[PDB]
Amino acid sequence: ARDPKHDILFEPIQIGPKTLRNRFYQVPHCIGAGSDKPGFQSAHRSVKAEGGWAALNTEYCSINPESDDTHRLSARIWDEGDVRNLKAMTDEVHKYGALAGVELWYGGAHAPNMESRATPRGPSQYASEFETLSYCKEMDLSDIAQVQQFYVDAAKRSRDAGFDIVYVYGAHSYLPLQFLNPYYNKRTDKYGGSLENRARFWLETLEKVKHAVGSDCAIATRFGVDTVYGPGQIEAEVDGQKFVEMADSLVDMWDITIGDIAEWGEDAGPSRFYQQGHTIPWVKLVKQVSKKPVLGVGRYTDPEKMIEIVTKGYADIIGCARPSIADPFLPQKVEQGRYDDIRVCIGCNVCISRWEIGGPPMICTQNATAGEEYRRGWHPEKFRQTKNKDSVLIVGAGPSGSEAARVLMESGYTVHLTDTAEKIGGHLNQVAALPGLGEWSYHRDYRETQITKLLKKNKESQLALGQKPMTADDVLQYGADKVIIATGARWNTDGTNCLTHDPIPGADASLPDQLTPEQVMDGKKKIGKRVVILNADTYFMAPSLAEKLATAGHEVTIVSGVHLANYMHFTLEYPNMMRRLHELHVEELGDHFCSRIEPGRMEIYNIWGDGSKRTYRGPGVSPRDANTSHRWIEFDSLVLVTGRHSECTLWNELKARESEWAENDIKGIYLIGDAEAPRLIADATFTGHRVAREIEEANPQIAIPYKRETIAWGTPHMPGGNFKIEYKV
Amino acid sequence: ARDPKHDILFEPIQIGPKTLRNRFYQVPHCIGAGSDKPGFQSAHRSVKAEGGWAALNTEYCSINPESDDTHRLSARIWDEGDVRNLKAMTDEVHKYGALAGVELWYGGAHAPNMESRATPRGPSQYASEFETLSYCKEMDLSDIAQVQQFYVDAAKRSRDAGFDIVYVYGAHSYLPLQFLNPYYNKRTDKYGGSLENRARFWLETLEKVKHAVGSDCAIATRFGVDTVYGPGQIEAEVDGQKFVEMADSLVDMWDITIGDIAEWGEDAGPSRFYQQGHTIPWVKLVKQVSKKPVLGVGRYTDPEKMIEIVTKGYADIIGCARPSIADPFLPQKVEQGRYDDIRVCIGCNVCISRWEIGGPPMICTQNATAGEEYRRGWHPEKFRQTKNKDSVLIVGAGPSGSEAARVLMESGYTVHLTDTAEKIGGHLNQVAALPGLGEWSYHRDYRETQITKLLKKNKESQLALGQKPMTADDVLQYGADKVIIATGARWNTDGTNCLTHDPIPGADASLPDQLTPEQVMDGKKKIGKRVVILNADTYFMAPSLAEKLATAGHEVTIVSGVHLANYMHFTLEYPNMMRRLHELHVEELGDHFCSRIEPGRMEIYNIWGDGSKRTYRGPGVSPRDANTSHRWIEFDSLVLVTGRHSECTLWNELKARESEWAENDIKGIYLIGDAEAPRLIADATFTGHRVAREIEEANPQIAIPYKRETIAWGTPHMPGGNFKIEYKV
Numbered sequence A, B: 001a002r003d004p005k006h007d008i009l010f011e012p013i014q015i016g017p018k019t020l021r022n023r024f025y026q027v028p029h030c031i032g033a034g035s036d037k038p039g040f041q042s043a044h045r046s047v048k049a050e051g052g053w054a055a056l057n058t059e060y061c062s063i064n065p066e067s068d069d070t071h072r073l074s075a076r077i078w079d080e081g082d083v084r085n086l087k088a089m090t091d092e093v094h095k096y097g098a099l100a101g102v103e104l105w106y107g108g109a110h111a112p113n114m115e116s117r118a119t120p121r122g123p124s125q126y127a128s129e130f131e132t133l134s135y136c137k138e139m140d141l142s143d144i145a146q147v148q149q150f151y152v153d154a155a156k157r158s159r160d161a162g163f164d165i166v167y168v169y170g171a172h173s174y175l176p177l178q179f180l181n182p183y184y185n186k187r188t189d190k191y192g193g194s195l196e197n198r199a200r201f202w203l204e205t206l207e208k209v210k211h212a213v214g215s216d217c218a219i220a221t222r223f224g225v226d227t228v229y230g231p232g233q234i235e236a237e238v239d240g241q242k243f244v245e246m247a248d249s250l251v252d253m254w255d256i257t258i259g260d261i262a263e264w265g266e267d268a269g270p271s272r273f274y275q276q277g278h279t280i281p282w283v284k285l286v287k288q289v290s291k292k293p294v295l296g297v298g299r300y301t302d303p304e305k306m307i308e309i310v311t312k313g314y315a316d317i318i319g320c321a322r323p324s325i326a327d328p329f330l331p332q333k334v335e336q337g338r339y340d341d342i343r344v345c346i347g348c349n350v351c352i353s354r355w356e357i358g359g360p361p362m363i364c365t366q367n368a369t370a371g372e373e374y375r376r377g378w379h380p381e382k383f384r385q386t387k388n389k390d391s392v393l394i395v396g397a398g399p400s401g402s403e404a405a406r407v408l409m410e411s412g413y414t415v416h417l418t419d420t421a422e423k424i425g426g427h428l429n430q431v432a433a434l435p436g437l438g439e440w441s442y443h444r445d446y447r448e449t450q451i452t453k454l455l456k457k458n459k460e461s462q463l464a465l466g467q468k469p470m471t472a473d474d475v476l477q478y479g480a481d482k483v484i485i486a487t488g489a490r491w492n493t494d495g496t497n498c499l500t501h502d503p504i505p506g507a508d509a510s511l512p513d514q515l516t517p518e519q520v521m522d523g524k525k526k527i528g529k530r531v532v533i534l535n536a537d538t539y540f541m542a543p544s545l546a547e548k549l550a551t552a553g554h555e556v557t558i559v560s561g562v563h564l565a566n567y568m569h570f571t572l573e574y575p576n577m578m579r580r581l582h583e584l585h586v587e588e589l590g591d592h593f594c595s596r597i598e599p600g601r602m603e604i605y606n607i608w609g610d611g612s613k614r615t616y617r618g619p620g621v622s623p624r625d626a627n628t629s630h631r632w633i634e635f636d637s638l639v640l641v642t643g644r645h646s647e648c649t650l651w652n653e654l655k656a657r658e659s660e661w662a663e664n665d666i667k668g669i670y671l672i673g674d675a676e677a678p679r680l681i682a683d684a685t686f687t688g689h690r691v692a693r694e695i696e697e698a699n700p701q702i703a704i705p706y707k708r709e710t711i712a713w714g715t716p717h718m719p720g721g722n723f724k725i726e727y728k729v
């Protein structure tokens, strides 16, 4: 039963001519579908509609070809073909009684236009601080009228597509905000200077959009109320609140964010730096002066926090993006009082990293069905029930093993999950202990909670933790119909890395002065004062250990052969991470790797040290002059973060003795997660989810085909268009 | 008439059961089309078929979902949908009497599989040196059987699609090469160790493919004969030649390359480092031991060079990739003796940069129609003729103005091209003078040659160089019906940059100790010993100037607020560029920018110097602790490379006096190229080509829409498939 305190979250709220059934609102957010993958777009949004969310929005939607984000993927409302594709989403969302919204976007120079090759226009000419080679043309008065017209035309197509909510997008430093912000706007005419002038472009656009579709659609505006850069850009109590007062009568609802685009991690707060509700100080400032419904994201996943902001008058609606990805059924579970079934977002930003990389579909660390709803037919809360009585033994309870266990149990199988470790979680139990990664434990907390309750539904299922390591013989005679090996991976101990694919002479983590990430995290092995971290990995391990060690008083130097924290650019953690390492005085030696290690010292070299000229000098000799940049640096302790290797000995033994499987009535043994190949936690979780869903297929080791959303030759995107080659001659 | 010496280039050559009509062969190369953009794929290849190329190949073609290059785009031959889409290309190519080929690809860990989420397999487990977070599973004997079967199935699907040539792709360190190369292969079974064991995987695969389609298709293999890393990887005179001897009986033709994947710029040699025929020393070693037709790329654009390699026995066929993109009609022009009509590739690698970025379609600096054949209907050699007598005045003869002039003249308009400069080329004349960029001149040599020739066909047209700068009055009273302003851009002189969008206090290129790129290239202003280059641009200017000054004896330090030469990662010039700067002792100070400048000194700061923690402290106050990393550095001369701005003064005046156009019989004035917004030379060229093609449209300032190749909701990619959402429950 739902706690009566949460009843307020289920009261309807009027937004202009529309009514939200409850206070759960999915703000606009990327998923890697746009108007190019209609199935993905409709399935992902409609499951949330089924899940109870009051309104579902598309991601930023380009109003015209001159605002093309390629290589990144945005939605598009350019023509009739887009209207058709996007309607599939509004139709499916309406089916479950929810509203559908679109976020009208024009990016200025922030849009690289790599597909269209068109020229972006802006208030003044500038080179984007995000897309450094992208420049825009300064707009004259007719340019302004024309772009405003693009918005009107787009709003009209949106109504045709079935959208109930139309946004004039002014967050993440996009067009309307560029005119408002002096950082971009250097004009001296009526569209620049004073706030009245700087606000003019936005005010006129809102008015024109309202005039065109305001009777049929709710007009909302997304606004970056503070750029969080201090004086120089937008400040909430200066221009921020004043603009709200000015535009209040034209808008039906305010959707608030903070930050710009280069650092939008200030908005999409990674759990590494920000807790739930991190945006409250800025968001509440809007309610204070607005007379319209206000909402502002803040990684809300806890109903207690949700009621707090609402009853305290900080917001009227609960806007979420990531929380809705991790759990499309969040509203329903709160309504039904099923608090323990809520799959809480861990704020890892891996979903976002996909958008930033440009082009690939979204994936989620918690929800392995995100992005898979349409192409694989995986509903996050509905599982195909087994008709047989097969039992499954799962060796390893990490992200992959525990997810496979959870899905199989949900499907009705009898499962036996075992691990030598005392708790479910595998390597993730160590990872969440790294500085700032505490919330990543929700991944294992959820699986622990779920597996425990699922055990009550089938007494033949068993959970055996803190056990002795399973052996080949133990597995063969266990008596399970099928076996899933999810034994994980370990960090290399001999220097093996992606640059050479070979060990490094002198690297041995069993030595007193060398450690692996595991040895550092266990905290038993002593670590000297001067620490050198040798890195060949582009994600979080090296910087996280550097932070941990520096805060403990060690002198840290990171020698990196690959771009340090590269992947963190995509998760939006990079800027604050660099600032953190800087305040801790961590020295970084990029573009360098190690050729040999000795006790207390190592020889490093610049990776660009070979001669620039290539000459054919015959066999046995390099075609470039020798690298002579080698130099030795000393250390008290050397931490090796060179790469990982699959722990697949058990698997290898079982495979060698495959002929014995039949004799023991073993129908199949499958290898998943890091034990198959070291992966991102999200993908490790996915492999477990997949073998569980496809356990009855011919070969669960390899995935069955998924529906592909690619154009079919002979079918034009434009209704009634000619698909054939036509040269203009 | 064609020079008799070039007759040999038109002799047919037998490759297995197929015959090449001449020696012009387009090797496989990316274009950003794959199987996702069938129109782009068929049009781009067929124009070359019409241009006389004997055979046209697709780019690398994935044989199975576990070799998915997303975010990069490759062709795919996974199912019937792909066969349908790819057949569009083979049909169109056959229409012009040419053969079509497909390059079967399996990438190992080099394929990040971001769309499929599948696990790649390889000879041993390793983390790709290219995709550092991508690991593969070590293959057992059944894995090997299964992957070889993938190739067979792909080959069979290829034959169904109408391909005449089927490749087993073993270049760029892909699968077959991974088994042959000790760098990847650490196996101890019959597939590792000795050369015969290392070659086993490739040999078996070739044999199975030949057996499956060898009677209907020619079997070719692409091979990286030398990884150009010296001992440790493949060496031409060691394993290289021997593998050729072993496989010779199985292949119908050898397609040779050099280098790996991380640095394939060694293969696709940038003119900055390599001249035409740079691969010869390696390629010739193959013909030395082979009995089958050999071909090896080398940026061949000159017929004199083409006949040299053939008559000297270095190769039997002329394989080209880039030269075919710059000029789809290269073969026909040679055949007809029209040597001066050949549009020579400048080896800028901008086409390639688009593939590396991942997702965007290809563009060409020389050929503005590349990628536009299908979507815009632009044929590179056919222009729609005008039916009126309009004359067009073009102010500025740089990349944009000269291309607009060329296309207008080809279309039959009377054109008046003028510039204050002595010759055609604009800023490109200074750029080609930078160290190693000499071949970029071909862009202006081509336009100079064509314009000169086109003037002869219309005596009303005129070329006026070395003139006084055109003023608004001059333009208004000139007498032309339409005017095109192509006045270019200039580098900023006040420190204005993408980071702040404002000038830097103390920045003034008129002072004796500060210079702009133009001042450095003119070589008149004196430059002191210690030079500091302040950079905020991510392409070639800062590195090139640094090289130029260092070779001249100056002590150079580059202070960069953006990732130095980032765009060069995409053009494949980065590795050799960094080695060059290192040899020249150029110091780099990344992650730093400039707050203020004084005579002989500048104050710099670390861009990550602000506090990592964000706290709301009200208006007027920054939410982060202040950056205190500021320090002063000295210099004798400071070179400013902070950004560019459009030179649009003339345009602005004309627009202000728009009311005067009608009375002077001026129908319209258009702004193109860098004057509209600083662009890459390729896009500047594109703007000129576009206004020219659309001069008769309602508004030539804005492009008319192009055909979009996006799926239409309601049409499944799989023929006979269901497009509706279907959950597996």
Ligand SMILES: Cc1cc2nc3c(=O)[nH]c(=O)nc-3n(C[C@H](O)[C@H](O)[C@H](O)COP(=O)(O)O)c2cc1C
Pocket (backbone or CB within 6 Å): A027, A028, A029, A030, A031, A058, A059, A060, A103, A171, A222, A257, A267, A268, A269, A297, A298, A299, A300, A319, A320, A321, A322, A323, A351, A352, A355, A362
């Ligand atoms: C995968 C992803 C992509 C995003 N892209 C958009 C976008 O298209 N448009 C937009 O206005 N905001 C975008 N957002 C930002 C979200 O709207 C939101 O402001 C952010 O995720 C914080 O909300 P949350 O803390 O509830 O996730 C994106 C967020 C996510 C998760």
Ligand SMILES: Cc1cc2nc3c(=O)[nH]c(=O)nc-3n(C[C@H](O)[C@H](O)[C@H](O)COP(=O)(O)O)c2cc1C
Pocket (backbone or CB within 6 Å): B027, B028, B029, B030, B031, B058, B059, B060, B103, B171, B222, B257, B267, B268, B269, B297, B298, B299, B300, B319, B320, B321, B322, B323, B351, B352, B355, B362
């Ligand atoms: C735009 C582009 C993409 C490429 N992609 C491929 C590819 O898919 N498969 C392949 O084997 N080679 C690829 N290449 C490499 C070319 O096949 C060729 O080896 C290289 O460009 C050198 O030939 P050229 O000097 O005549 O251009 C690519 C080259 C270009 C120009």
Ligand SMILES: Nc1ncnc2c1ncn2[C@@H]1O[C@H](COP(=O)(O)OP(=O)(O)O)[C@@H](O)[C@H]1O
Pocket (backbone or CB within 6 Å): A395, A396, A397, A398, A399, A400, A401, A418, A419, A420, A421, A425, A426, A427, A428, A468, A469, A470, A471, A486, A487, A488, A489, A647, A650, A672, A673, A674, A675, A684
């Ligand atoms: N022989 C074994 N018997 C039981 N548990 C094992 C055995 N070998 C490894 N494990 C357990 O398997 C788990 C693997 O988890 P983890 O490394 O997180 O992998 P993944 O990320 O693939 O889920 C670890 O908790 C480890 O204790």
Ligand SMILES: Nc1ncnc2c1ncn2[C@@H]1O[C@H](COP(=O)(O)OP(=O)(O)O)[C@@H](O)[C@H]1O
Pocket (backbone or CB within 6 Å): B395, B396, B397, B398, B399, B400, B401, B418, B419, B420, B421, B425, B426, B427, B428, B468, B469, B470, B471, B486, B487, B488, B489, B647, B650, B672, B673, B674, B675, B684
């Ligand atoms: N007022 C003018 N009259 C004539 N030519 C001009 C005038 N202003 C600039 N130019 C010329 O216009 C040309 C612009 O070329 P460029 O900078 O290469 O631009 P783009 O790359 O756009 O073609 C330069 O050669 C410059 O001399």
Ligand code: SF4
Pocket (backbone or CB within 6 Å): A322, A323, A325, A326, A344, A345, A346, A347, A348, A349, A350, A351, A352, A363, A364, A365, A366, A367
């Ligand atoms: S990928 Fe991570 S941050 Fe994104 S919704 Fe999932 S758990 Fe949340």
Ligand code: SF4
Pocket (backbone or CB within 6 Å): B321, B322, B323, B325, B326, B344, B345, B346, B347, B348, B349, B350, B351, B352, B363, B364, B365, B366, B367
């Ligand atoms: S973009 Fe450059 S390197 Fe590529 S085909 Fe064109 S001129 Fe050649």
